[PDB]
Write a protein that binds this ligand. Structure first.
Ligand SMILES: Nc1nc2c(ncn2[C@@H]2O[C@H](COP(=O)(O)OP(=O)(O)NP(=O)(O)O)[C@@H](O)[C@H]2O)c(=O)[nH]1
Ligand SMILES: Nc1nc2c(ncn2[C@@H]2O[C@H](COP(=O)(O)OP(=O)(O)NP(=O)(O)O)[C@@H](O)[C@H]2O)c(=O)[nH]1
Ligand SMILES: Nc1nc2c(ncn2[C@@H]2O[C@H](COP(=O)(O)OP(=O)(O)NP(=O)(O)O)[C@@H](O)[C@H]2O)c(=O)[nH]1
Lengths: 316, 301
């Protein structure tokens, strides 16, 4: 049952310790009938100074802070995430890659700035209400936790979100689309990487299209209009749509190749941004599409409109 | 769900801290042996909540556990499982500082800065004695040691296994040293009668030749060790439970693995009784006292 919190860096050990500690504490805290305003101004803070004890993986001295834990537990709940699963994903094995994924690819951990943490505080009450009235059906980031770590007297802010991508299905192309009138294409450097992060003009030059058929595409566009209206009404800009392309046949070959030494099927309760390609589409594919980078406080109404138009035009 | 509801915030912090340190320890591997640093080590945690989890705990407090590896090994060598110790402290608030856990298995005594210092001076030797007598001893069985800070005030506590039974009511109590009780204490419900009261009452404890020999062997070994460590002013705690009064699911029945200081009365004893006897108060810093104590304690069989 023993959790060593072994990780290649002490900050990752402290992260694992912290998620374990906060979730265990929370398991002794009753689930409220409702959130109260103080829950949105609340935090939990722990400071450890061990001496000649338990030094194999954790530092002897560290701090851990969890922002609005009652709120983020409610968020996890409204997103269909059990707390025991969440702690297991962060602590069973060290997260990998600052940008991390939990070892099981279910959750993403992004280090952020003090400013981002402030902006999250400013938007939390409204973001939470948006999640309750859209019943968790949104393309926005699903925020599950937010933490401050102190190791070596150095503070590190982190936000945990559900992965946009599948936790099991491989992503073969990815685009970061914003819709800027300004030219946005990928560097030859980025274009030489294993999975380049292609920008908008790369998408446009390729003649790329995503064929999902009428029903899924309607659900997607309705979410998109509501989501970017929300972002505009909060005076937020610079956000992107993350797009990941999974090629089913390519996956089948890659798997049979590792085997020498369901296909294109996924659980929507888990891969919440995933859509199958239309029955009559050239290659059988799975798409993952979500809004990302929503923490940055030129016009946000215009950004909403241009974004929604460009992302309307990447489907059929 | 462990709410840590307690009659004072300090008992809440104690419950919280014992729960926390024991849960952390279950994540720390059991070493092949204790190391010297284990005898100089501590864990320290400082909690600062804000608008959160304040229903029973304070929002700000500190908790320090001295030598967690050592005291975990002591618990093991005393036949006490960590989850059971944790349950006794945390399932329900401790009762009456001198406290017992809700089930009366363990005693929690508030102690001084000096006492904590003295335990640090004796710990390596006390542990070695424990391994060398296989836990078969009448000395206090130390299970943990903690410093709590609530409202900026530090409080030190030592947890021991109870001398008395956790189930059988004890009907008379004596504190024996050798060298009387107050009219005040003599008015309390259960007086602590001292040695001269025991002598004046003519109280005797008949355990028969067989049990009395091994008990005297342990007593001599313990008090010789205490002398070899230069400790004095300690006492022998004696408690007497009379079965027939309890009658006014069985009478005089007990688990020796739990009430480890308990002894049945001999067949050739007037009344049927149970005795609980162990050495207590060994923490405030001659050989002659060892000898005189062992003499007074020899002549009660
Ligand atoms: N709007 C809002 N911002 C907050 C809230 N809590 C923290 N922040 C912002 O989050 C940022 C980082 O938070 P944090 O590092 O915890 O700030 P701190 O309390 O100054 N900690 P320290 O003094 O130890 O460095 C700061 O810019 C702070 O203003 C809150 O409840 N609401
Ligand atoms: N698998 C996965 N990758 C993600 C997710 N969100 C972002 N990424 C990827 O991680 C990187 C960082 O994303 P982003 O939030 O936009 O960070 P950024 O600061 O704007 N860009 P930069 O890479 O220069 O730091 C990008 O390569 C992006 O494609 C996610 O939910 N899942
Ligand atoms: N139930 C129980 N009572 C105990 C145990 N150990 C001590 N006590 C009781 O609690 C009292 C605590 O006082 P003690 O630690 O002996 O300190 P003291 O200085 O010798 N006497 P005092 O402080 O009362 O003047 C003891 O006198 C005894 O009556 C134990 O293991 N179980």
């Amino acid at each position: 049952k023993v959790k060593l919190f072994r990780a290649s860096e002490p900050i990752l050990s402290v992260l694992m310790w912290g998620v374990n500690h906060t979730i265990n504490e929370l398991s002794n805290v009753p689930v409220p009938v409702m959130l109260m305003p103080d829950d949105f101004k609340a935090y939990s803070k722990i400071k450890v100074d061990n001496h000649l004890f338990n030094k194999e993986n954790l530092p002897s001295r560290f701090k851990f802070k969890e922002y609005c834990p009652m709120v983020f537990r409610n968020l996890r709940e409204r997103f269909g995430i059990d707390d025991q699963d969440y702690q297991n994903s962060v602590t069973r094995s060290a997260p990998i890659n600052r940008f991390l994924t939990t070892y099981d690819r279910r959750f993403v951990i992004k280090t952020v700035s003090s400013e981002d943490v402030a902006e999250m505080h400013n938007i939390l009450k409204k973001y939470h209400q948006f999640i309750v009235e859209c019943h968790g059906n949104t393309l926005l980031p699903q925020f599950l936790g937010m933490y401050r770590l102190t190791v070596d007297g150095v503070e590190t802010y982190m936000v945990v979100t559900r992965n946009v991508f599948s936790h099991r299905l491989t992503v073969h192309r990815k685009y970061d689309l914003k819709g800027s009138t300004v030219a946005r294409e990928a560097s030859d450097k980025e274009k030489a990487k294993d999975l380049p992060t292609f920008k908008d003009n790369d998408f446009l030059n390729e003649g790329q299209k995503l064929h999902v058929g009428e029903e899924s595409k309607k659900n997607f566009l309705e979410k998109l209009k509501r989501d970017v209206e929300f972002l505009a009404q909060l005076k937020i800009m610079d956000y992107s749509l993350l797009v990941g392309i999974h090629d089913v046949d390519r996956a089948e070959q890659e798997e049979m190749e590792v085997e020498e030494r369901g296909p294109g099927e996924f659980d929507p309760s888990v891969d919440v941004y995933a859509m199958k390609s239309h029955e009559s589409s050239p290659k059988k594919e799975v798409y993952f599409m979500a809004i990302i980078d929503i923490l940055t406080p030129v016009n946000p109404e215009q950004y909403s409109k241009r974004f929604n138009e460009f992302m309307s035009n990447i489907l059929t």
